[PDB]
């Protein structure tokens, strides 16, 4: 909210994109991230790789 | 049928991922304490590591801002996308008891790995080309490589303590 310099999407990825001409992509598709609250859980493949891998 | 991004999470750290998960869900253990080995410190450690091996200007800021990217990426997901519903009590607890300390610090290394697990899913809805994504995954995998390398003295899942019934009263 406060002390927020716009978005990191155009300060970090500012250089990252200009260095790669990726500007095009991150300008058309900007990063707002309306990220909701979601229980992290865990992908089952990892669980089975560790446990059921033998 | 969506062709979602397929990112291999370090299989060196898969046991650790399942361990962390096992602790929270199966073991009923929570992480209510500020760790000294925190994400930001590991980020800085990695950032300086790439510089100490080869002192450069061009790669210096590159590592620097990519690390800052992981920082902000972690900040936008930590309390929302990288947290279990059972960690809600400890979140409010640590947040209240230490309202001065950042969550990238208090939650230590164990919570760092969660970022890469969810980031691959969210980046599937924001699909750039293979090349830009490749450079991203390149430095991400490079970091994960170093992360797994030092993981023995990096991750301390043993700080997870079993949440007592009286503590569960904040989860119900």
UniProtKB/Swiss-Prot annotation, chain A:
Full protein segment contained here:
69 to 119 of 204
Cell location: Nucleus
The gene from which this protein is expressed is MRGBP
Provide the function of this protein: Component of the NuA4 histone acetyltransferase (HAT) complex which is involved in transcriptional activation of select genes principally by acetylation of nucleosomal histones H4 and H2A. This modification may both alter nucleosome - DNA interactions and promote interaction of the modified histones with other proteins which positively regulate transcription.
Tell me the protein's name: MRG/MORF4L-binding protein
- State the family named in the UniProt similarity comment for this chain: Belongs to the EAF7 family.
Native source organism of the sequence: Homo sapiens (Human)
Q: How does it assemble?
A: Component of the NuA4 histone acetyltransferase complex which contains the catalytic subunit KAT5/TIP60 and the subunits EP400, TRRAP/PAF400, BRD8/SMAP, EPC1, DMAP1/DNMAP1, RUVBL1/TIP49, RUVBL2, ING3, actin, ACTL6A/BAF53A, MORF4L1/MRG15, MORF4L2/MRGX, MRGBP, YEATS4/GAS41, VPS72/YL1 and MEAF6. The NuA4 complex interacts with MYC and the adenovirus E1A protein. MRGBP may interact directly with MORF4L1/MRG15 and MORF4L2/MRGX.
From Swiss-Prot, chain B:
Q: Where in the cell is it found?
A: Nucleus
What ranges does the record give for the region Interaction with RB1-2, renumbered to this chain? Answer: 133-154
User: Which positions are tagged coiled coil?
Assistant: none
TM ranges: none
Q: What is the effect of changing residue 61 to A?
A: No effect on MRFAP1 binding
What superkingdom does the record give? Eukaryota
Consequence when changing residue 64 to C:
Reduces binding to MRFAP1
Residues annotated as domain MRG: 4-172
Record region (Sufficient for interaction with PHF12)? 4-152
Which residues does UniProt assign to the signal peptide?
none
Its biological purpose: Component of the NuA4 histone acetyltransferase (HAT) complex which is involved in transcriptional activation of select genes principally by acetylation of nucleosomal histones H4 and H2A. This modification may both alter nucleosome - DNA interactions and promote interaction of the modified histones with other proteins which positively regulate transcription.
The subunit field of the Swiss-Prot or TrEMBL record says:
Component of the NuA4 histone acetyltransferase complex which contains the catalytic subunit KAT5/TIP60 and the subunits EP400, TRRAP/PAF400, BRD8/SMAP, EPC1, DMAP1/DNMAP1, RUVBL1/TIP49, RUVBL2, ING3, actin, ACTL6A/BAF53A, MORF4L1/MRG15, MORF4L2/MRGX, MRGBP, YEATS4/GAS41, VPS72/YL1 and MEAF6. The NuA4 complex interacts with MYC and the adenovirus E1A protein. MORF4L1 may also participate in the formation of NuA4 related complexes which lack the KAT5/TIP60 catalytic subunit, but which include the SWI/SNF related protein SRCAP.
Name of the protein this chain belongs to: Mortality factor 4-like protein 1
Q: Which organism is it from?
A: Homo sapiens (Human)
Point out the gene that encodes the protein.
MORF4L1
Q: Whole protein: which stretch is covered?
A: 194 to 362 of 362
